[PDB]
Amino acid sequence: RESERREVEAKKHKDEVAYLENYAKQ
Amino acid sequence: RESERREVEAKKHKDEVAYLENYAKQ
């Protein structure tokens, strides 16, 4: 379970950097 | 140990996203 939590928090990193990219170029 | 690490990760993620949306609100 803790390993799975590691992968899902990596996914959260991906989502957050994705939103930063979405609103970065404006 | 794993639970508290996940908690600190989650709070820093929400802080980051709050920072980004506050910056982008203009």
Query: What is the structure's resolution, reported in angstroms to one decimal?
Result: 3.4
The backbone torsions φ and ψ at residue A23, rounded to the nearest 5 degrees and listed phi first, read -105, 20
Q: Does B18 touch chain A (CB under 8 A)?
A: no
Helices (H), chain A: 2-22
How many CB contacts within 8 angstroms connect chain A with chain B? 20
Q: A23 to chain B nearest CA, in Å? A: 7
Q: At what angle do helices A2-22 and B2-24 cross, to 10 degrees?
A: 10
Q: With CA atoms as reference, report the closest residue to A10 among B13, B21, B15.
A: B13
Tokens 């820093």, residue? Answer: B12
- What kind of experiment solved this structure? cryo-EM
Q: A17 to chain B nearest CA, in Å? A: 9
- Torsion (CA) A7, B23, A22, B12 in degrees, nearest 10: 0
